[PDB]
Amino acid sequence: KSYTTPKKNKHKRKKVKLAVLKYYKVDENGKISRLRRECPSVFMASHFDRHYCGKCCLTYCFN
Amino acid sequence: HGSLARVGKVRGQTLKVAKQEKKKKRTGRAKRRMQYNRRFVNVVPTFGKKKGPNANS
Amino acid sequence: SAADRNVEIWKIKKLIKSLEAARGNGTSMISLIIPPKDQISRVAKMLADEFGTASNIKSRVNRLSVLGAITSVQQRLKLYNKVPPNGLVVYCGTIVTEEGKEKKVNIDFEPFKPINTSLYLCDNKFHTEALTALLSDDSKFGFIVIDGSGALFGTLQGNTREVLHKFTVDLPKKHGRAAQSALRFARLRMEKRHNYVRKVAETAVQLFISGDKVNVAGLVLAGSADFKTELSQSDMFDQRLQSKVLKLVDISYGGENGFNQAIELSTEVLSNVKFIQEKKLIGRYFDEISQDTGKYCFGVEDTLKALEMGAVEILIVYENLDIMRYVLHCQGTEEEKILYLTPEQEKDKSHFTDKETGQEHELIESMPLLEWFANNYKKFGATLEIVTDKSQEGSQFVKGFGGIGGILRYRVDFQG
Amino acid sequence: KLTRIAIVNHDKCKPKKCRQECKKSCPVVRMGKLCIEVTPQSKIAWISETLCIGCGICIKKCPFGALSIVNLPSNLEKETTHRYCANAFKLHRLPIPRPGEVLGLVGTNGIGKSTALKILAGKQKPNLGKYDWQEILTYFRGSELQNYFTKILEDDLKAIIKPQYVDQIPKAAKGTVGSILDRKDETKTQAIVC
RNA sequence: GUCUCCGUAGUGUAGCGGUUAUCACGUUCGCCUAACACGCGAAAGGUCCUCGGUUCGAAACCGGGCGGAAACACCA
RNA sequence: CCACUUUAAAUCCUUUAACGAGGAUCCAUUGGAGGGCAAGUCUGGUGCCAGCAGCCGCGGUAAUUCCAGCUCCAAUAGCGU
RNA sequence: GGAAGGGCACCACCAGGAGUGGAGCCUGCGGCUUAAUUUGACUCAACACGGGAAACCUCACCCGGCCCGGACACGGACAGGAUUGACAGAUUGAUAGCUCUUUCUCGAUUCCGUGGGUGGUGGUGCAUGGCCGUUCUUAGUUGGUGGAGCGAUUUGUCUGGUU
RNA sequence: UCAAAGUUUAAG
Ligand SMILES: Nc1ncnc2c1ncn2[C@@H]1O[C@H](COP(=O)(O)OP(=O)(O)O)[C@@H](O)[C@H]1O
Ligand code: SF4
Ligand code: SF4
Ligand SMILES: [Mg+2]
Ligand SMILES: [Zn+2]
**Nearest ligand for residue D113 CA:** 1
Helix C392-399 vs helix C256-290: crossing angle, to nearest 10 = 50
Name every residue whose Cβ is closer than 8 Å to that of residue C276 and which is 6 or more positions away in sequence.
none
**d(Cα C267, Cα C270) in Å, to the nearest integer?**
5
DSSP state at residue A7: T
C146, C227 Cβ separation under 8 angstroms: yes
Strand partners, C166: C152
DSSP state at residue A12: P
C-alpha closest to that of C94 among C77, C78, C74, C71: C71
How near does any CA of chain C get to the CA of D1, in Å? 15
Distance D89 CA to ligand 1 centre (A): 7
The amino acid occupying position D166 is: V
Method: cryo-EM
**d(Cα D47, Cα D85) in Å, to the nearest integer?**
12
Nearest nucleotide by C1' position to the C69 CA atom: G31
Name every residue whose Cβ is closer than 8 Å to that of residue D185 and which is 6 or more positions away in sequence.
none
C167 CA – E53 C1', rounded, Å:
35
Q: Which atom of ligand 1 is nearest to the CA of D91?
A: 17
Name every residue whose Cβ is closer than 8 Å to that of residue C166 and which is 6 or more positions away in sequence.
C150, C151, C152, C153, C255, C256
Residue D18 Cβ inside 6 Å of ligand 2? The answer reads: no
C230, C237 Cβ separation under 8 angstroms: no
Residues of chain C contacting residue A2, judged by C-beta atoms under 8 Å apart: 98
**d(Cα C74, Cα C71) in Å, to the nearest integer?**
5
CA torsion sign for C71, C75, C76, C81 is positive
- Measure the CA angle with vertex C59, ends C58 and C61; round to 5°: 150
C-alpha closest to that of C228 among C200, C192, C203: C200
Can you give the resolution of this entry in Å? 3.7
C126, C19 Cβ separation under 8 angstroms: yes
Q: Other C-beta atoms within 10 Å of A17: how many?
A: 6
Q: Other C-beta atoms within 10 Å of C387: how many?
A: 23
Residue D7 Cβ inside 6 Å of ligand 2? The answer reads: no
C-alpha closest to that of C413 among C314, C304, C316, C302: C302
**d(Cα C81, Cα C67) in Å, to the nearest integer?**
23
**Nearest ligand for residue A38 CA:** 5
DSSP string spanning B12-47? HHSPP-----------HHHHHHHHHHHHHTS-----
Question: Could you give the C-alpha distances from C207 to C85, C115, C193, C202, C213, in angstroms and in order?
Answer: 21, 21, 21, 9, 11
